[PDB]
Amino acid sequence: SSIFLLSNVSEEARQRAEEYVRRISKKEGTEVRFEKDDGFLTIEVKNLSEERLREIAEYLWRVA
Amino acid sequence: TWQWVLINISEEARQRIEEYVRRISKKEGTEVHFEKDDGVLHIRVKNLHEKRAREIHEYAKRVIL
């Protein structure tokens, strides 16, 4: 399980972050959970390849 | 196996999270692998139970905030 944690992200950026991971999990067929806690956005993906994990990390880092 | 990707967090928060995970990994008999890039901190803990993962995640948000 992989957990992406973002801080103080805008709802504009929160939508882009969630939308990017959804179609990845939609193509791989893996479970994904999106949780918001004040200024935190938690993106939890299950059984995701490290190749895809680095992609999400690079995108969220450019977004944040 | 649980992996955390903390994005654009403080240097002091990263220190507290790494030490907290190392203590948890020591008591549970597992090992943790850390990776650090500019603004991205990877934490990979092999053989971690579900309640431990939630605890580490809550402590992460506590010190990152």
Author numbering:
A (entry chain B): 66 to 129
B (entry chain A): 1 to 65
Give the text the authors published on this PDB structure.
We set out to design sets of interacting protein pairs for constructing reconfigurable assemblies. We instead sought to use implicit negative design by introducing three properties that collectively make self associated states unlikely to have low free energy: First, in contrast to the flexible coiled coils and helical hairpins in previous designs, we aimed for well folded individual protomers stabilized by substantial hydrophobic cores; this property limits the formation of slowly-exchanging homo-oligomers. Second, we constructed interfaces in which each protomer has a mixed alpha-beta topology and contributes one exposed beta strand to the interface, giving rise to a continuous beta sheet across the heterodimer interface. Our implicit negative design principles enable the de novo design of heterodimer pairs for which the individual protomers are stable in solution and readily form their target heterodimeric complexes upon mixing, unlike previously designed assemblies.
We determined the crystal structures of two class one designs, LHD29 (2.2 Å) and LHD29A53/B53 (2.6 Å) in which both protomers are fused to DHR53. In the central extended beta sheet, the LHD29 design closely matches the crystal structure (red and green box and Table S5). Aside from backbone beta sheet hydrogens bonds, this part of the interface is supported by primarily hydrophobic packing interactions between the side chains of each interface beta edge strand. The two flanking helices on opposite sides of the central beta sheet (blue and orange box) contribute predominantly polar contacts to the interface, and are also similar in the crystal structure and design model. Apart from crystal contact induced subtle backbone rearrangements in strand 2 of LHD29B that promote the formation of a polar interaction network (blue box), most interface sidechain-sidechain interactions agree with the design model. Association rates were quite fast and ranged from 106 M−1 s−1 for the fastest heterodimer to 102 M−1 s−1 for the slowest heterodimer LHD29, which is still an order of magnitude faster than the fastest associating designed helical hairpin heterodimer DHD37 (10). LHD275A, LHD278A, LHD317A, and a redesigned version of LHD29 with a more polar interface (LHD274) were also predominantly monomeric. For the C4-symmetric hub in the absence of its binding partner we observed an additional concentration-dependent peak on SEC, indicating formation of a higher-order complex. This is likely a dimer of C4 hubs, since the C4 hub contains the redesigned protomer LHD274B, that despite its reduced homodimerization propensity compared to parent design LHD29B still weakly homodimerizes.
